Amino acid sequence: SARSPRFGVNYTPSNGWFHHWLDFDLDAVRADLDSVAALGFDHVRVFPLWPVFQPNRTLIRPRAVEQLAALTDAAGERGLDVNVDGLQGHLSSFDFLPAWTTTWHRRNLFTDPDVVSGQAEYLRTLAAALADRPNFLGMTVGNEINQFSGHPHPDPDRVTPEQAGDWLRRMLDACERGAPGRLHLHAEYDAAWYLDDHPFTPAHSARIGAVTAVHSWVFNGTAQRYGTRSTATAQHAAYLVELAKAWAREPRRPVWLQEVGAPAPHVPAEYAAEFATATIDAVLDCPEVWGVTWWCSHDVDRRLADFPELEYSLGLLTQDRRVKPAGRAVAEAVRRWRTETPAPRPRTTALVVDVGPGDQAPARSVCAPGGAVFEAFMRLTAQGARPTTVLAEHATDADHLAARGITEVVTPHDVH
Amino acid sequence: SARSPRFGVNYTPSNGWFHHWLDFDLDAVRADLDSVAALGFDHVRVFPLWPVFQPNRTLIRPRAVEQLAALTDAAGERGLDVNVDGLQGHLSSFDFLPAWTTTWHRRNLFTDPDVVSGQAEYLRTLAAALADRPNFLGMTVGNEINQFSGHPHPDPDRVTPEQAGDWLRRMLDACERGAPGRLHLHAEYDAAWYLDDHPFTPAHSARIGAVTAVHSWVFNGTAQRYGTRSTATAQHAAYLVELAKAWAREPRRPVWLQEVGAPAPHVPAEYAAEFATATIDAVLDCPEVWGVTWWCSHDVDRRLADFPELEYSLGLLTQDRRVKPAGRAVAEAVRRWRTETPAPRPRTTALVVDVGPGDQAPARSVCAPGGAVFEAFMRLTAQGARPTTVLAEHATDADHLAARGITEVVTPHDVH
Numbered sequence A, B: 001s002a003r004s005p006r007f008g009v010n011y012t013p014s015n016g017w018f019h020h021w022l023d024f025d026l027d028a029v030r031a032d033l034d035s036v037a038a039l040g041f042d043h044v045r046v047f048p049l050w051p052v053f054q055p056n057r058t059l060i061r062p063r064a065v066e067q068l069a070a071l072t073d074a075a076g077e078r079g080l081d082v083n084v085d086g087l088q089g090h091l092s093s094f095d096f097l098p099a100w101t102t103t104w105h106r107r108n109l110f111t112d113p114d115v116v117s118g119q120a121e122y123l124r125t126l127a128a129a130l131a132d133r134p135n136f137l138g139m140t141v142g143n144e145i146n147q148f149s150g151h152p153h154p155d156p157d158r159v160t161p162e163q164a165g166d167w168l169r170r171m172l173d174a175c176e177r178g179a180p181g182r183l184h185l186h187a188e189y190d191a192a193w194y195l196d197d198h199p200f201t202p203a204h205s206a207r208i209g210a211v212t213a214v215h216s217w218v219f220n221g222t223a224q225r226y227g228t229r230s231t232a233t234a235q236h237a238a239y240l241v242e243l244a245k246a247w248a249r250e251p252r253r254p255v256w257l258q259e260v261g262a263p264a265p266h267v268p269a270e271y272a273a274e275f276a277t278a279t280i281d282a283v284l285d286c287p288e289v290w291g292v293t294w295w296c297s298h299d300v301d302r303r304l305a306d307f308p309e310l311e312y313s314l315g316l317l318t319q320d321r322r323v324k325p326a327g328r329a330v331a332e333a334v335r336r337w338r339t340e341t342p343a344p345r346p347r348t349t350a351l352v353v354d355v356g357p358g359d360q361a362p363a364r365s366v367c368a369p370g371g372a373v374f375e376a377f378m379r380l381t382a383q384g385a386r387p388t389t390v391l392a393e394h395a396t397d398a399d400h401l402a403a404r405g406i407t408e409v410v411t412p413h414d415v416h
Ligand SMILES: CC(=O)N[C@@H]1[C@@H](O)[C@H](O)[C@@H](CO)O[C@H]1O
Pocket: A091, A092, A093, A094, A144, A147, A189, A190, A215, A217, B104
């Protein structure tokens, strides 16, 4: 009954980046997706710009929607399924916020009834427009929208965890209404697991939406503390996968590694291929992985200003559509895992994750790089123990353990 | 040598409002400008959306520029000259701010060297693209950009007056560089004359840029304090014209009434025609008026949300291009003033304007509705004295007075 992982890329348009919606060129998209499918991927994750699609609360532009459908059709012709992220929102250090949510109309993104009603109509419209596309996977509410909810954001839209979970439900309700039965989820960046009192929580990620989405980025302190060529750096995606399982109510709830990339300087370009192989191999030794989706397809145009340096070189391909060695290595790992490798065995040893109550997760920073749970997991991993995780409050739950096939339970104090 | 006033409208596209740049339709623009020229106007004031034209600091979209040129050409065919406002920025309660100026990239609009360098390139590019258009008037830096500089803005980019004047110079330098010899100016809303310690000052408006631009809006407290059918309400545009002259170094520096409109409920629709006639008649009794430019050509689409109620009905035409009675009245006033009315006589009586030092204007609120200078001017006007204004520091300057033809000088204390 073992789950079979899918392989895709986050689509970063080579001509004009996500600004290409302002000058939409289907032939340029066709060429981008051509070089994507030639690498053997089976899906793309694609990004509308929210204020370009909804420049006024009650103006959702049909032409923008039509363009998204044409993109989805071009991908379908090429054997690529499409997940669409709705609320961007945040992309690569930039916040794209509609004028009707800011300054003179500043209205909290998660709690204002008019903005939330506008967000719902937006998501529902996209989902409904794509509902007749057989290659349309479903919606992700918005890329790492939790980054708006608190520190370190310079101007956050603050919310309680209950408010955040309620907002997520309404957003996913809208996706479900536009495209019933599709794969609708939300995706939060790693503050949801690592930052104490961050409003978006691990329970939100593991108990709302169809699958848990994780974004694995070793610039978060991991590569800095442990080195580029290290257990922790190579295993960081696998760790996020197994950590996220602890809060899941369903024992076989899949986990989607929706973002993973090789950020220089933390991963120099010369080590990107090697890093990509080890990371993919390591995470695919985890059961129930829904898929691996690399960030990103194409380098960002170097004529575009003010990106953090790491953002420019994250592509599997260059801006002129040449395949990088790291692109070649990911394609090779995809090919090997689709055909030549067996399913991963169950992880029967569980590391106890004690995070405080854990619905609220007030001390989740023990899971962050340098934390006791983090280092206990990498130590076990290095010892060959192939660990999963379990919450302290379920660590003696014979039904939880047996449902998961867990036969051994250890704490970080046990690991030392 | 008397100056002859021009007549135009602020172009508010009927299909999609200023969001029409996202779905640019030249035939829809042609039809809009057709109904404009049929009313007898000779120019339009037109508004790019800054973040649509410059979505990234070093991406100024050539297609957006091409669209602006096609709009300018369509207008030229119809005998309409074009002023282009650059930095929007602010339009009708909405702030359109590029992602590269906000939150994670928050960089002060008036002082950050990278943003200011980006603004310069933007203005220079627009001006240069239109420089070969014989109907291209010139640039206005940006619509009421001073609203970003302080209270009551909820999130201002604060600046000292010296910083604001320096920024204006650099912005106009860029316009001049792209289109030498053209009519380049800046336009600040009435806080520049009315709000104590507002960073943009009357000296900035009267001593930087080719002409002084004023925006006359009787919802600023005037209609509320004095009534819709009153001297002060009818004369408010004329007052702003004559007030703005006090800070001018050149005695014949023209003043452009770049915005004037009839906002309901302060001016009910049934009184818009009558209000428009009286306002135009009153301001055109002021010498050196560069022109009168009505806000706006077309009602805002009522399907667009979150505008202040007054914004929807400010058009001379409805959203379906029917001419309103107020449109008919403005066209009639234009026709009469172009052919049937003599030039206004000089205003030889000057009201003293004591504002504190006045370069800095720390007590300019004496010019605001309810202020001593304001009410002294309306009282003189009602008495038939046809007043101009003079700064306290120049009130005994025999050369200033004679250069202006001023033969009588009175203070508000004199008027009582
Ligand atoms: C402010 C900032 O740059 N935040 C980044 C975000 O852009 C990125 O998507 C995320 C990936 O995990 O990492 C965050 O640290």
